Design a protein around this nucleic acid. Structure first.
Ligand code: 3AT
Ligand code: ZN
Ligand code: ZN
Ligand code: ZN
Lengths: 50, 46, 65, 1105, 50, 34
RNA sequence: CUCGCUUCGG
């Protein structure tokens, strides 16, 4: 029910325990991202009856 | 080509082809929404 | 619709303190002492939790399912 | 020794709202109309027959409306929820069926259930499916439990029939004319005829004017015509005061100048002064005296009845009217129209009753005409009505009248417009307040004076603050929180009690008794019920009987001592309000009664029956003495106010501490809050509307009025509480502007969602060819859909979840051009939009006409920015002038940085102390975890919140020590910090921003189009041209009005002076004198129009030198 | 993060990149970073009694 | 066909509420205004 | 598209 943009905004506000000093600023563009300057989090929840 | 829809109360996957009167099996309800797309969508946290 | 993750003014994480707050209301606690026990000192987070309406379950009652 | 106070007295208000109040007006009126009134109308028109072929008839037996159903299924009905009617763009109606008996071939044939029409069904009415349902059942039906209901659904749109306000009928009105002459008027209206008859004093003598008379005639002649012939009796009826005879003498002299002395002579005079109604077909012996007598008996003063050509009562009525005119001709006691004791409210029920009566009469007339055309000529195959009873007549009439909103009743000569309006779904408060609106009989069409004013009669009945700010200020009004509209009564027991109470019959005495100082006339709905002495006993007995229950509690009795008239009102539409009865300085309501009410022993009806609370009409409350509070009760007090804050309406109930503000601020807040952004209902996700505004994280207000609790506004909030600090910052908040915090907006403050609708139809035409949607046109180069068709699914309809850009197709619609192979031309539904939008859902339905209805719900997520309008629940509408970073914001010792910085300068001019008190109360409440109340004429006092603040360690006045965010140094002055309930308005800069290139032009005059929706350009009005002229800028004026708008080059013949084409003059058949000339296109259109009007403009050209 | 009902599903991936709170408030590390001057209340004359 | 370069790549592309049939190769505006 | 009607905004 939560809209996609609202869900993304909520996910952005969640703090991440990763140490920022170990990464670098992502370059302008480069939406793919590399190992140095990004992290990936998978969220997969399927609700079903008990 | 299987075109799939979801009725408003059964919420069951119904495959209907072109020029079919809009209905649903195991119901008679006639509001037939379309399923969400499979293409990836990118959103900005801003 | 749903409890905001962050407090609007200060920015303290308030999203994770919602359901537990309800537990304190499911218990005998008043509003003020429950907010004190949750650790909301400045009044902005107290306004965040106190004035929030949980519309998500009422909307989910109208969800397809 | 202060008088004891019943603290729980306010608890009477919710109990009342359990049975009446906000929305129950329309619902009760519609239930009465569909359960009682329709049967009365059918009984009035039960038998229809034709003059040709007697012994043939069609008789109606019983009528039913049934439950709402849909005719989609082939000759089969199916129960339908209102939300389904909303989605399918169909009407939410129920089948009007009737059982009849008629004669086919002189053999009686009866039908027990024969459909004839469809009634659009008001939501939450008796027949509506939503009534008597639980919130879980509401969820199963996809309807919000908090929806007010009371509105019709026609063709998918929600229409509300506004409550009409009009002057009461059959009442004497003494008024001044344009020339200052004090005349009289009465609009005698019965169930059949409305006629306004006037009395004038134009030459010191009284004439009676009516539309059926060629010329106004002296009143004495009319008196002689109506049976009374002696002049002395007429003078006795007028009055025995000396000045009355002095004033009425000239009329007697004028009568005596003519030789009119008998009833026959006056009847002959009137018949001479009679005008034939356009050669009325059929002549009953050169009628004249009979015409005059019929006009006197029927047409003139219709509401006054003549038993059998006995004009005694009508004589008394006109004598009373003459006496009132004479008395008002001295002391200028001219009655005012704006007094709401003379006003009546028509709900949806009465309007629908009139419409159904007209439609049923038309249906019966059509049936009779068909019978006349068919029966006497056809065959031994006997004509029967069932083969001719068209069922679309009533249904189409109802649907068109409700949808378009224009009502044309030829039987009543009533042409009304704007009866129904589209229900506004901007917010819950918007719909709730629109549900209780009242429209005026006069329109903002002109600058009137008086109705627009706030009359004191609106007390307790209508909201004083709630009125639309603009051209319709004062002409659209809102009902108060605790009010009731009366219905019609039987009028029988009132007459019986009045006769038994000593009221002498008027026919038994001469008119001289009317002039006695102690004799009081008693009326009843404009009819003289009689005369009485010692009217105090009669009034007290009538009120006591009404309290006892033998008389209906809505029957009103009032006394006018100046005119010495006791008025008894029993007609419907009058405004009433409950009041606590006070007997000898002690209220009938005690603490024990309120305790029983709280415990559930008794309800409001029990209070009504036990003579504790009684309804007061405006006319009746004119004679009563009402005390606002217990301490105000004195010896001469007859009633007690239940709750003062019920004076305000529904929208004005949102204002915290409204009594601390200036009234224009309250009016602005009512208007603003009608437009507040917020949640609509629990089914706002399944609902698909043309435009919907939602708030991401709505919050209930910290300072809530009891009206908010009563209407359950906190369940559907329409705003957010922001930590407002009142200070001047950066000079970006000069005039009503406010500064927003960038971090707050980044954390979801003010985040809003805009839902728009895009609907398409695929209809099958008369020829067996239909609209079809192609699949996406794949690009052969890349084997992928082209950029325009990027979002389309395999079926040619855009799939939910993707984002749409400008000039992209949502539905790949292609339609035939024939109506031999079909030829399809493309008319795809493109998305016109400045910004990207996301498709949330796509709904596909099929109507009975095989028309495929497709609706896409596009969603946009908008963040507050520069230009977004913000309100503060106190009429302090503002624009976000600057968005500063969080670190630049000032901070307190605790580290709190404000979300909104509002300029202090807005306070002194507007004196909105209520905002300051609300801020203080909200700060105290959030500190101690409470919800303070800003109830009108009450609420939490300043002292208590100050004590709470000092107890919590903050300053007792909200002002806090603050360090500047920029310089890092403390501010010299303490800053006023606190949570304020700010609400975002629908007015956004993104929607309002407009820019115009060359763009399109209009065909008639080649100038840019009008509106933003049509990509129109801005307009240089007449005053802009005047300002440019005043500047003297000739070249810029020429460039703006000629070069940049409608420049054109025409060919003018220098010989004939007319317009040629392509360097050739057809008139002169030559091309030597044709010269090109620059000109505005509108001027060329004007010249051609003038030529068509035979006003030939001939242009004599010359060289520019 | 969100609330679901049976049948509903949330499947997504999140790319996290380094950023400063000036660009967006979601990057701010501190809930509240503030300072106040140390008070020093002084008594001009000796106060005794109630 | 485009009157300038002779191509047949005539695309109907509306640019900010201005209907416009334009060559897709050289950008020559063939027709404009409705 | 034209036209009218309403509701807004100011
Ligand atoms: N019908 C109208 N004609 C011309 N200008 C208008 C009209 N309605 C609004 N405006 C514009 O709005 C401005 C009216 O504001 P003004 O009357 O001075 O303050 P206000 O609306 O009384 O606010 P307060 O109630 O004093 O807070 C001035 C004018 O340019
Ligand atoms: Zn189904
Ligand atoms: Zn906070
Ligand atoms: Zn010529």
């Amino acid at each position: 029910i939560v809209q996609d943009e609202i869900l993304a905004h909520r996910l952005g506000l969640i703090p991440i325990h990763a140490d920022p000093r170990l990464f670098e600023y992502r370059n302008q563009g480069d939406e793919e991202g590399t190992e140095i300057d990004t992290l990936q989090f998978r969220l997969q929840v399927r609700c079903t009856r008990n | 080509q299987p075109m799939i829809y979801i009725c408003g109360e059964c919420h069951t996957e119904n495959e209907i082809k072109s020029r079919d009167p809009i209905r649903c099996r195991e119901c008679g309800y006639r509001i037939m929404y379309k399923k969400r797309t499979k293409r990836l969508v990118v959103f900005d946290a801003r | 619709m749903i409890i905001p993750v962050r407090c609007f003014t200060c920015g303290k994480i308030v999203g994770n303190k919602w359901e537990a707050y309800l537990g304190l209301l499911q218990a005998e606690y008043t509003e003020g002492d429950a907010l004190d026990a949750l650790g909301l000192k400045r009044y902005c987070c107290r306004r965040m939790l106190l004035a929030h309406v949980d519309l998500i379950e009422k909307l989910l009652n109208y969800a397809p399912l | 020794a202060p008088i004891p106070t019943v603290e729980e007295k306010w608890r009477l208000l919710p109990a009342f709202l359990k049975v009446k109040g906000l929305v129950k007006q329309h619902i009760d009126s519609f239930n009465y109309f569909i359960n009682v009134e329709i049967k009365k109308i059918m009984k009035a028109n039960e038998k229809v027959t034709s003059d040709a072929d007697p012994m043939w008839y069609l008789k109606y037996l019983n009528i039913y409306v049934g439950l709402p159903d849909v005719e989609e299924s082939f000759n089969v009905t199916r129960p339908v929820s209102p939300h389904e009617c909303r989605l399918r763009d169909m009407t939410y109606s129920a089948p009007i069926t009737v059982d009849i008996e008629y004669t086919r071939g002189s053999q009686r044939i009866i039908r027990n259930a024969l459909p004839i029409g469809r009634m659009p069904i008001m939501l939450r009415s008796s027949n509506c499916v939503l009534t008597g349902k639980t919130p879980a059942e509401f969820a199963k039906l996809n309807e919000c439990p908090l929806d007010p209901g009371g509105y019709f659904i026609v063709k998918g749109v929600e229409k509300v029939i506004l409550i009409q306000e009009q002057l009461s009928k059959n009442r004497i009105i003494v008024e001044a004319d344009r020339k200052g002459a004090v005349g009289a008027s009465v609009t005698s209206s019965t169930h059949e005829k409305k006629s306004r008859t006037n009395m004038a004093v134009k030459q010191g003598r009284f004439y009676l004017r009516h539309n059926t008379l060629s010329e106004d005639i002296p009143i004495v002649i009319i008196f002689k015509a109506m049976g009374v012939e002696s002049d002395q009796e007429i003078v006795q009826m007028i009055g025995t005061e000396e000045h009355v005879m002095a004033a009425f003498g000239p009329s007697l002299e004028e009568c005596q100048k003519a030789q009119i002395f008998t009833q026959m002579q006056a009847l002959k005079y009137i018949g001479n002064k009679v005008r034939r109604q356009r050669m009325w077909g059929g002549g009953p012996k050169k009628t004249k005296i009979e015409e005059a007598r019929e006009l006197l008996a029927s047409t003139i003063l219709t509401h006054v009845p003549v038993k059998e050509f006995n004009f005694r009562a009508k004589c008394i009525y006109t004598a009373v009217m003459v006496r009132r005119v004479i008395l008002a001709q001295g002391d200028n006691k001219v009655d005012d129209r704006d007094y709401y004791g003379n006003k009546r409210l028509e709900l949806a029920g009465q309007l629908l009753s009139l419409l159904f009566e007209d439609l049923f009469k038309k249906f019966n007339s059509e049936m009779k005409k068909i019978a006349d055309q068919v029966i006497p000529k056809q065959r031994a195959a006997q004509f029967d009505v069932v083969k001719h009873m068209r069922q679309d007549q009533i249904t189409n009439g109802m649907v068109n009248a409700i949808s378009t909103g224009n009502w044309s009743l030829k039987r009543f000569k009533m042409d009304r417009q704007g009866v129904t309006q589209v229900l506004s779904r901007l917010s819950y408060i918007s719909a709730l307040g629109m549900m209780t609106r009242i429209s005026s009989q006069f329109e903002k069409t002109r600058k009137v004076s008086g109705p627009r004013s706030l009359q004191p009669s609106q007390w307790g009945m209508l909201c004083p603050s709630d009125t639309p700010e603009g051209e319709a200020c004062g002409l659209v009004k809102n009902l108060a929180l605790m009010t009731h509209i009366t219905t019609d009564m039987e009028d029988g027991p009132i007459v019986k009690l009045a006769s038994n109470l000593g009221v002498e019959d008027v026919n038994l005495l001469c008119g001289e008794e009317l002039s006695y100082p102690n004799v009081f006339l008693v009326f009843l709905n404009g009819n003289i019920l009689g005369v009485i002495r010692d009217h105090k006993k009669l009034v007290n007995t009538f009120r006591l009987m009404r309290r006892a229950g033998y008389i209906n509690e809505f029957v009103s009795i009032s006394t006018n001592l100046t005119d010495r008239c006791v008025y008894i009102s029993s007609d419907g539409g009058r405004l009433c309000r409950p009041y606590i009865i006070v007997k000898k300085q002690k209220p009938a309501v005690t603490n024990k009664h309120m305790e029983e009410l709280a415990q559930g022993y008794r309800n409001f009806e029990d209070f009504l029956h036990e003579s504790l609370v009684e309804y007061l009409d405006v006319n009746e409350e004119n004679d009563c003495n009402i005390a606002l509070y217990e301490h105000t009760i004195n010896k001469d007090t007859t009633h007690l106010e239940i709750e003062p804050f019920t004076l305000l309406g529904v929208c004005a109930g949102l204002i915290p501490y409204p009594h601390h503000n200036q009234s224009p601020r309250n009016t602005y807040q009512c208007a603003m809050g009608k437009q507040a952004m917020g949640t609509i209902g629990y089914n706002q996700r399944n609902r698909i509307d043309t435009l919907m505004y939602l708030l991401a994280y709505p919050q209930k207000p910290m300072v809530k009025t009891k009206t908010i609790e009563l209407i359950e506004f906190e369940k559907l909030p329409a705003g957010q509480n922001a930590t407002v600090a009142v200070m001047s910052y950066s000079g970006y908040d000069i005039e009503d502007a406010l500064v927003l915090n960038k971090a707050s907006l980044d954390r979801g403050f003010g985040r809003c969602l805009v839902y728009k609708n895009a609907k398409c139809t695929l209809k099958r035409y008369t020829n067996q060819t239909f609209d079809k949607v192609m699949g996406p046109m794949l690009d052969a180069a890349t084997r992928k859909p082209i950029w325009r068709h990027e979002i389309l699914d395999a079926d040619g309809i855009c799939s939910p979840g993707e984002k749409v850009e400008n000039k992209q197709v949502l539905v790949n619609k292609s339609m035939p051009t024939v109506t031999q192979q079909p030829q399809y031309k493309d008319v795809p539904i493109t998305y016109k939009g400045a910004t990207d939008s996301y498709i949330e859902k796509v709904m596909i339905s099929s109507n009975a006409e095989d028309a495929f209805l497709i609706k896409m719900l596009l969603r946009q997520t908008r963040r507050p920015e520069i230009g977004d309008k913000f309100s503060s629940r106190h009429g302090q509408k503002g624009v976000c002038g600057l968005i500063v970073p969080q670190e630049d914001m000032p901070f307190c010792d605790s580290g709190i940085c404000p979300d909104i910085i509002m300029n202090p300068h807005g306070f002194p001019s507007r004196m909105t102390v209520g905002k300051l008190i609300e801020l203080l109360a909200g700060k105290a409440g959030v500190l101690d975890g409470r919800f303070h109340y800003g109830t009108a004429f009450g609420g939490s006092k300043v002292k208590d919140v100050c004590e709470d603040l000092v107890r919590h360690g903050y300053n007792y006045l909200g002002k806090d020590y603050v360090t500047s965010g920029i310089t890092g140094e403390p501010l010299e002055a303490y800053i006023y910090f606190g949570p304020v309930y700010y609400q975002k308005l629908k007015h956004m800069v993104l929607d309002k921003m407009h820019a115009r290139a060359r763009g399109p032009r209009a065909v008639l005059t080649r100038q840019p189009t009008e509106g933003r929706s049509r990509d129109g350009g801005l307009r240089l009005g007449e005053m802009e041209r005047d300002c440019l002229i005043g500047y003297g800028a000739s070249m810029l004026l020429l460039e703006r009005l000629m070069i940049s708008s409608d420049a054109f080059e025409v060919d003018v013949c220098g010989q004939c002076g007319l317009l040629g084409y392509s360097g050739w003059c057809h008139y002169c058949k030559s091309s030597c004198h044709v010269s090109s000339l620059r000109i505005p296109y509108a001027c060329k259109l004007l010249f051609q129009e003038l030529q068509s009007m035979n006003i030939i403009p001939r242009l004599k050209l010359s060289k520019y030198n | 993060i969100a609330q679901l009902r049976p049948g509903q599903e949330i499947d997504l991936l999140m790319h996290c990149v380094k950023g400063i709170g000036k660009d967006h408030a979601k990057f701010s590390p501190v809930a509240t970073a503030s300072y106040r001057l140390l008070p020093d209340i002084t008594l001009l004359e000796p106060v005794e009694g109630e | 066909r485009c009157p300038d370069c002779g191509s047949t790549e005539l695309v109907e592309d509306s640019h900010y509420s201005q209907s416009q049939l334009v060559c897709s190769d050289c950008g020559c505006v063939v027709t404009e205004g409705v």
